Design a protein around this ligand. Structure first.
Ligand code: IO6
Ligand code: IO6
Ligand code: ZN
Ligand code: ZN
Lengths: 251, 251
């Protein structure tokens, strides 16, 4: 499987043709306000410079491996530990976010992938409701160089070859996320690549994060994927809700 | 373990000392309206007379083992299958529901216990988020005789001994529940007996079921529990929410 044409994803993974896939188009007016949704809790995300973290070009994204002890709660007793994060992005002059808002695709999107602490292993959790939870944020263009993102973007040139990897200093993972942890959309969907396993709780922050134009260009223009090809437009098309109501934590 | 005596329940199952137990006191005023909560759907609940079901006095309740093919959806993609139902009751002039509403305990309560389709068996589901789901309804004294309930209650004399069981004709299991599947409370909780595992989605109907006074008397006055004593007041003490919000499917 690659982005941009065959093999068709259901022929790779029949799961990719399930009823409750991700990503989706968020339409705020149809989202259901649910006051039960409490502010996200993220502890342990402020990493010291040592030890160092693996940053890998895997041909589908750039992926940072997170150490044990990043703990996240979606609600009382509903806790998670962070595994990895990675980006989705477009190309020169084209947005590449996975989720969209009223049809708007954003320049890029960050995913932070967590495992329910009720499961010892990711593979127990795949397919199980709530087993995995992803935190997603939109990346937009802004006037300033983002210092937290720059720690990653300034290392992309060292892993430009598909399958290559570097070690980065520890950073504040929470500094990559939006201001307000109380404002988000939530629904249940899937991995957005094969194996397209369902039961994934998606939390999309209402607020975006801002990168410079140079920074965004760096993200789309630096990396090389499968073939002799450019790692770009690494996003799945939005998928039908098929009866799912997207919930929101704010009126 | 018994209702009232030894051993203490945390000695049996550590999980019985979790923060997020059931049952709870439903305060409808503090409940969060959640328009995402749609009407529950049941498939396969209208059973024919054969094959027969096992109904058992297990010393703590009367439990009807349910057959395969009883499917229940909490919403799009939240699919379950019924395992069993059982009842909780009081005594003469003493109410015996497990849940209470604004402190009010009802004469009795029915539980339909279900397993998430993501799990092959209960011990995999225990402690996992959304692994089990209980539909719960209160039974109240009413003027007419409930004929759905008469089917089961007329067979109780046969299982008066603790640990005894009988076979009973299949019936419309859905007729044991309220007719309104759209007005309900929902919260995350625990099993109300050891192992008291959390991760359980409780759905408590707003509409009640009506039994006659004879019926309620049959229920509470027929069966015998451990030792020389009657099986009565077979309900756990209300448990503090500990910061959980109960959702309501209605404003
Ligand atoms: C045993 C590991 C298999 C699962 C690992 N994962 C993926 O394949 C995969 C694919 C896509 C995403 S995204 N776009 O956040 O949804 C996340 C993951 S994953 O859980 O780390
Ligand atoms: C491997 C253990 C099997 C557990 C089976 N079950 C219980 O122990 C237990 C205890 C309490 C309830 S109630 N009162 O509705 O919450 C339901 C069940 S159960 O799932 O059938
Ligand atoms: Zn992703
Ligand atoms: Zn029960």
């Amino acid at each position: 499987w690659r982005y941009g044409g065959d093999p068709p994803w259901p022929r790779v993974s029949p799961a990719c043709a399930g009823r409750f896939q991700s990503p989706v188009d968020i339409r705020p007016q149809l989202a259901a306000f649910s006051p039960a949704l409490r502010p996200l809790e993220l502890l342990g995300f402020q990493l010291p410079p040592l030890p160092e973290l693996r940053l890998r070009n895997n041909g589908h994204s750039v992926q940072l491996t997170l150490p044990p002890g990043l703990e996240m709660a979606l609600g009382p007793g509903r806790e998670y530990r962070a595994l990895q994060l990675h980006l989705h992005w477009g190309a020169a002059g084209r947005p590449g976010s996975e989720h969209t808002v009223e049809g708007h695709r954003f320049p890029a999107e960050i995913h932070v992938v967590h495992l329910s602490t009720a499961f010892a292993r990711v593979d127990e959790a795949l397919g199980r409701p709530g087993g995995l939870a992803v935190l997603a944020a939109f990346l937009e263009e802004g006037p300033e160089e983002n210092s937290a993102y720059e720690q990653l973007l300034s290392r992309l040139e060292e892993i430009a070859e598909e399958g290559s990897e570097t070690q980065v200093p520890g950073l504040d993972i929470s500094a990559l996320l939006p201001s307000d942890f109380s404002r988000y959309f939530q629904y249940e969907g899937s991995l957005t690549t094969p194996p397209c396993a369902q039961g994934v709780i998606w939390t999309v922050f209402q607020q975006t994060v801002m990168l410079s134009a140079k920074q965004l260009h760096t993200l789309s223009d630096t990396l090389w994927g499968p073939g002799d090809s450019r790692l770009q437009l690494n996003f799945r098309a939005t998928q039908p809700l098929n009866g799912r109501v997207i919930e929101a934590s704010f009126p």
